[PDB]
Design an enzyme around this catalytic site. Structure first.
Site, PDB file in Angstrom:
ATOM      1  N   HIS A  41       0.824  -1.465   0.057  1.00 40.53           N
ATOM      2  CA  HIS A  41       0.122   0.043   0.049  1.00 40.53           C
ATOM      3  C   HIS A  41       0.898   1.202  -0.045  1.00 40.53           C
ATOM      4  CE1 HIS A  41       0.123  -0.449   4.371  1.00 40.53           C
ATOM      5  NE2 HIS A  41       0.239   0.698   4.454  1.00 40.53           N
ATOM      6  N   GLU A  72       0.474  -8.329   0.790  1.00 41.37           N
ATOM      7  CA  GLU A  72       1.000  -6.759   1.311  1.00 41.37           C
ATOM      8  C   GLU A  72       2.361  -6.809   1.603  1.00 41.37           C
ATOM      9  OE1 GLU A  72      -1.591  -5.015   1.272  1.00 41.37           O
ATOM     10  OE2 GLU A  72      -0.453  -3.135   2.201  1.00 41.37           O
ATOM     11  N   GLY A 146       1.654   5.881  10.756  1.00 37.51           N
ATOM     12  CA  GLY A 146       3.457   6.315  10.735  1.00 37.51           C
ATOM     13  C   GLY A 146       4.136   5.185  11.333  1.00 37.51           C
ATOM     14  N   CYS A 148       3.541   1.911   9.959  1.00 38.29           N
ATOM     15  CA  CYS A 148       3.487   1.017   8.890  1.00 38.29           C
ATOM     16  C   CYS A 148       4.971   1.033   8.327  1.00 38.29           C
ATOM     17  CB  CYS A 148       2.342   1.400   7.608  1.00 38.29           C
ATOM     18  SG  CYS A 148       0.784   1.011   8.150  1.00 38.29           S
TER      19      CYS A 148
END
Ligand SMILES: NS(=O)(=O)c1ccc2ncsc2c1
Length: 182
Positions: A41, A72, A146, A148
């Site tokens: 992402h 992911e 913040g 991730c």
């Protein structure tokens, strides 16, 4: 303060950089040579910033399993003039549960941040922002924006990267040794 933070710190001080895409800043884990991982992402393009340096992306792969389901994880090869310390020997070979995990973050905002998230479950399936996702780890810390790309370690193993949360739990994409065979 203990062996968990000791291992976490050793990984953060040599094997992380600050990645920035069109979707903001991320903890990026360097695995070997010029090869690093980031949540899918992050939307990596042809160009990325690494510690505030315009960097060409030589290759970028958003991993999926053989069920053709999102994992992911995006593996990125960077046009960088320096190799990462090789940490592939710290990756687990199998999906597993863990005790006493640390989630470690380094950004401009959150430098040198270490969170004792505790017990980690092999959660498996998760609907992550509407995307069916496999090989998810879950832990019981109310993590936030913040964090991730944050690196999840146990004393001895780098086991995943933080990819999301629901305000009560946090979720990491598994890192497996097989992802980085060459
Ligand atoms: N990592 S450890 O748990 O062995 C530890 C604990 C306390 C301490 N105080 C100063 S250095 C140090 C190391």
């Amino acid at each position: 303060m203990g062996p968990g933070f000791d291992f976490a710190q050793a990984i953060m001080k040599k094997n992380t950089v600050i990645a920035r895409t069109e979707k903001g800043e991320f903890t990026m884990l360097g695995v070997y040579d010029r090869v690093a991982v980031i949540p899918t992402h992050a939307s990596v393009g042809e160009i990325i910033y690494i510690n505030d340096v315009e960097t060409r992306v030589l290759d970028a792969c958003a991993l999926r399993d053989l069920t053709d389901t999102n994992l992911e994880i995006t593996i990125v090869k960077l046009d960088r003039n320096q190799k990462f310390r090789d940490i592939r020997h710290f990756l687990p070979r199998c999906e597993d549960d863990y005790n006493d995990a640390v989630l470690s973050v380094h950004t401009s905002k959150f430098p040198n941040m270490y969170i004792p998230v505790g017990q980690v479950t092999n959660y498996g399936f998760l609907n992550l922002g509407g995307t069916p996702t496999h090989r998810i780890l879950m832990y019981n810390f109310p993590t936030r924006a913040g964090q991730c790309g944050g690196v999840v370690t146990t004393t001895g193993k780098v086991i995943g990267i933080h990819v999301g949360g629901n305000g009560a739990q946090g979720f990491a994409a598994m890192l497996l040794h097989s992802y980085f065979t060459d």
